[PDB]
């Protein structure tokens, strides 16, 4: 009985929390109390299998019993279930209450307080890494335990809760790229990404060892993205124990991680810094360019030889990004398919490493260009610059999505331009790949752009260059200027700097959608007249009045220019 075995392995609480997540990720609209009762029925059924492992369904797999409880055939059943996981659920914005109201619920029933936390997050991020969600609940609880007894509860609690919100969004977007990598482009593309990421991380490890961890890693994320959260949880547990047992053959940075408890150990290993490179590392010319078995290896063992090139290039260059490395490996691949059918193969592929200089500088120049711009403008205005830029690229994308994606795109400047000039590319470009997958999955629910569909579906490694090479769209028909977007009320003066800037930025998109050929300096004139307008009328004694009257004036000047 797999269900009685899993229940005795985890205990009731941890068994219930992962079943709660699994339901919340699938049934994203049912209320909390209905999920709780659904979890209790699966828990009460697991206790009858402990008593008598020969009962009604104790021989069925827990994955099968979950769909059995879901309906109230395989493997098409789960595959059909997976098509109805909503990336943009129509749910209310999570408005967290007063600090004293949250601390009252936290002290009244802490076990339920955290279940609603798990429920509210999982129902909004149906691909959240379930083991990491459990870790987030531990830190969420830790902040309430400390701050509800602090002298200033809100000064303690709110900053910590804001950090978890930001960290949870990043975790959801990283894991969603992983799941989309598997579902859309296959496990073959996920293994390629993991071999390059792990070769950067564990340069001491052998190709067979990195390939072994990638097979285990592909199963952990297959289960967490295909719904078996309890097998995902145990598989990443086994992988942390295996990585710590064999750490001497993998990495020297794991010793600190391996002394920690299960949740923190698995987390520590995922966040571990790169290991030092072995000193006695040859140049890649020897075995891949100058060797005499290059076309024989490519012909005889294509996947091991090419995956060996990626591994060997990735561990030598942790200052490259994973998408840059996968591009280098594909270039080397296509050069050998061309060159190995030639007269003298060595006479043509002798200069293969010369085609990598273009591919490596192209992201370098883009990042230096954007970091240079971010130093001048700053986060808010850098986002405005990208908002203009990407609204001109794909104006069919909805205004909420254009604002969200562009704001995130502008956070790469704050995140990655504080790093030394050589550590910028992995930070920048791998984050850009994560934000563009946000746009790719929000646009795949309701496709409105042929270009976005094009960049998202064509490849997965060339997504950032695809979008970056996009010019202003000519096919787009300007939006009829609606003045309902540029007339605000006095409520804007009680908003946060963030929420207010989102309102300003939401105008900028609807402005560009109307005038897709406006100059970048012309669009900055309106926005500068915009900000002076909101500042003035929020200072006025009669705020409601001059928002109406001076608002009309500001609309006239913008339309006139």
């Amino acid at each position, epitope marked *: 009985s797999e269900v009685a*075995h899993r229940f005795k392995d985890l205990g009731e609480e941890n068994f219930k929390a992962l079943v709660l997540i699994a339901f919340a990720q699938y049934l994203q609209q049912c209320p909390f109390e209905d999920h709780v009762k659904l979890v209790n029925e699966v828990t009460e059924f697991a206790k009858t299998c402990v008593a008598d492992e020969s009962a009604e369904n104790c021989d069925k797999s827990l994955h099968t019993l979950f769909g059995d409880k879901l309906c109230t055939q395989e493997p098409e059943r789960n595959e059909c279930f997976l098509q109805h996981k909503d990336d943009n659920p129509n749910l209310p914005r999570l408005v967290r209450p007063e600090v004293d109201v949250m601390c009252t619920a936290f002290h009244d029933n802490e076990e339920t307080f955290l279940k609603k936390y798990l429920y509210e997050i999982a129902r909004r991020h149906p691909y959240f890494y379930a083991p990491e969600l459990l870790f987030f609940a531990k830190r969420y609880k830790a902040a309430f335990t400390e701050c509800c007894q602090a002298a200033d509860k809100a000064a303690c609690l709110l900053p910590k809760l804001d950090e978890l919100r930001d960290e949870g969004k990043a975790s959801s977007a990283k894991q969603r790229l992983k799941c989309a990598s598997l579902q859309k482009f296959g496990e073959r593309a996920f293994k390629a990404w993991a071999v390059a990421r792990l070769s950067q991380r564990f340069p001491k490890a*052998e*190709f*067979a*060892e990195v*390939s*072994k961890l*990638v*097979t285990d890693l592909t199963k952990v994320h297959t289960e967490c993205c295909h719904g078996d959260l309890l097998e995902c949880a145990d598989d990443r547990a*086994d*992988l942390a*124990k*295996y990585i710590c*047992e*064999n750490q*001497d*053959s993998i990495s020297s940075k794991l010793k600190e991680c391996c002394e920690k408890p299960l949740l923190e150990k698995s987390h520590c290993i995922a966040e571990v810094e790169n290991d030092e490179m*072995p000193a006695d590392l040859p140049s890649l010319a020897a*075995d891949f360019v100058e060797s005499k078995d290059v076309c024989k*290896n490519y012909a*005889e*063992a294509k996947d*091991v*030889f090419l995956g*060996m090139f990626l591994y060997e290039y990735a561990r030598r260059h942790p200052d490259y990004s994973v998408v840059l490395l996968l591009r280098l490996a594909k270039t080397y691949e296509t050069t050998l398919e061309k060159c190995c059918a030639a007269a003298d193969p060595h006479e043509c592929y002798a200069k293969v490493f010369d085609e990598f200089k273009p591919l490596v500088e192209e992201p370098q120049n883009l990042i230096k260009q954007n970091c240079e711009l971010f130093e001048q403008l700053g986060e808010y205005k850098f986002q405005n610059a990208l908002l203009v830029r990407y609204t001109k690229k794909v104006p069919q994308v909805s205004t909420p999505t254009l604002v969200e994606v562009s704001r995130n795109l502008g956070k790469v400047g704050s995140k990655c331009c504080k790093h030394p000039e050589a550590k910028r590319m992995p930070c920048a470009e791998d984050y850009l790949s994560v934000v563009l997958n946000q746009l790719c999955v929000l646009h795949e629910k309701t496709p409105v752009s042929d270009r976005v569909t094009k960049c998202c579906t064509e490849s997965l490694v060339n997504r950032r260059p695809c979008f970056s090479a996009l010019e202003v769209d000519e096919t787009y028909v300007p939006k009829e200027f609606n003045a309902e977007t540029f007339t605000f009320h006095a409520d804007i003066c009680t908003l946060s700097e963030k929420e207010r800037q989102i309102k300003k930025q939401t105008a900028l998109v609807e402005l560009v959608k109307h005038k897709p050929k406006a100059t970048k300096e012309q669009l900055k004139a309106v926005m500068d007249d915009f900000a002076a307008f909101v500042e003035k009328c929020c200072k006025a004694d009669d705020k409601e009045t001059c928002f109406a009257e001076e608002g009309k004036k500001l609309v006239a000047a913008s339309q006139a220019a």
Partner: antibody
Amino acid sequence: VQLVQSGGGPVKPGGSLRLSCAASGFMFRAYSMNWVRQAPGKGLEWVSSISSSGRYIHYADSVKGRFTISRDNAKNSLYLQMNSLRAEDTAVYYCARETVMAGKALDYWGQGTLVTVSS
Amino acid sequence: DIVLTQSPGTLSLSPGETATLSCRASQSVGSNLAWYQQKPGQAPRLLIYGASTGATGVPARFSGSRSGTDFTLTITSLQPEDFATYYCQQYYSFLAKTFGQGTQLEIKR
């Protein structure tokens, strides 16, 4: 995928032998190679294991100090130097290949070589 | 080094029956456990790797399973060429690869 073994035979106690494994049919330079032995009528015993580049080498406690594993990646060959041979080292010795990405299981074995340590 | 203990030493069954072989690990080895089949005079042959995943070409009546530190190899529609000796091997330990003592399938007549 071939693992052609060579070099066993009889020796006297304390003597030396050198086992060879000539591989072909796969990118030998990417796989870890193993030596497994089986005494006549007994079970499998793991002897040594060498990684792709030869960086990580492991021995069973029984042969620690006497056996030395090595490989020539240019010649696609695996070697086992057996010194200070004992009568308990009498067995059929197999060179096995590790799975490249399925773990450290042994998917291809050689035909085996018989080593008899007797006076 | 982790000790793998196989049971039983010998299994006497008739063709068509189901064989159930045991391999008990002294410590947890995760799913880093392989099954091998060996016929007289032949080199071992990989059957199962990763505790449950069967090797390419292995028929479907061979099925491995893990429950904690106890591993089971099950052969369901025993054919005459399924009768051989079977060994389990772990590859979790950093220090050594250890095998089991082996279990022999014998045709009961």
